[model samples]
Target chain A: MVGRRPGGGLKDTKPVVVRLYPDEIEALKSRVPANTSMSAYIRRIILNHLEDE
Target chain B: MVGRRPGGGLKDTKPVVVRLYPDEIEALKSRVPANTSMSAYIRRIILNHLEDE
Candidate 1:
């Protein structure tokens, strides 16, 4: 089973809904490189961006 | 006193670099809500953009 969110954990967390356009998703997919999980890919982008700042 | 990197057990990852123009940094800063950590703020932007895509 999927695990809880980091800050809110499981019980206190509220659900979030997101919608992405096909082209945008494709853009994200391309940026993410092959074989990485979407979450990991996103985290990488975030980490890289923060470090750059 | 600090936590390790999430993946690669804290040792296997390599460094990467990125650059953004001054205005781009301002855009990012203003887009993020006040009092949010820079990393969290940036992550929110990515999440929002992805969701809107």
Candidate 2:
């Protein structure tokens, strides 16, 4: 469901499984803002990383 | 250079490469405005798509 696109959107999307280490997972949890879904938060963080230029 | 973050900043960053088909590339190229670098333009588009909450 998370990877499903709207009919008006790009439907040919792919999801990649990424496993995090315990320490890495802790670091991510520490930085997560309140009330954000894990998926949305991770996506926002990734977009931020990509937009670092 | 793209994958490596600032050691002072967040290192160990990841990059996602998305390969588009010929028609998709043409579609993207058609949307490209003048004076925009390919990387920057693509980054902006991805960020926008991700940011639509």
Candidate 3:
């Protein structure tokens, strides 16, 4: 376990419901290559965004 | 098909490799509630990011 997050795991979590437009989903699908799972592609986009801050 | 993108689907897609740290994965997992599929959660984070830009 990394020391970076101490007790971060013990906190409560919340699920926010946010839905995307169907066209938006298609746009994203086209952006994603067939080789990778959609999860991997999105996580990369997000974490890199976090790193940039 | 939305008129916003014409012939957009006609182009090729690429797969980029990105492996997250296990800690990072766990962190993300905790941020997500047990109710939603992992795919749904990541998609929400990403499309909203696009909207912010």
- The most accurate candidate by TM-score is 3
Q: How badly does each model clash, as a count of residue pairs?
A: 2, 0, 0
**iRMSD of all candidate structures:** 15.8, 9.1, 10.0
**DockQ of each candidate's interface versus the true one?**
0.05, 0.05, 0.09
Please give, for residues B1-53, the per-residue lDDT of candidate 1 as tens digits.
37433334332322222223333444557666678965455445665656664
In angstroms, the error of model 1 at A27 is 2.6
Candidate of highest DockQ: 3
Candidates 1 and 3 compared: the better one by lDDT is 3
Candidate 3 residue B7 C-alpha distance from true site, Å: 15
lDDT of 2 by residue, A1-53 (tens): 75433334443323433322233334555666778855566555554544462
Q: Which lDDT value does model 3 have at B5?
A: 52
lDDT of 1 by residue, A1-53 (tens): 13322343232322222232344555666666578566434444443453465
TM-score of every model versus the real structure: 0.32, 0.34, 0.41
Worst 10 residues of 3 chain B by lDDT: B10-19
- Candidate 2, residues B1-53, lDDT tens digits: the string is 32223353222323444433333444456766899656445554444433342
All candidates' lDDT scores? 0.45, 0.45, 0.52
Candidate 2 segments exceeding 4 Å error: A1-53, B1-14
Question: Could you tell which candidate, 1 or 3, scores higher by TM-score?
Answer: 3
Q: Judge the docking of candidate 2 as incorrect, acceptable, medium or high.
A: incorrect
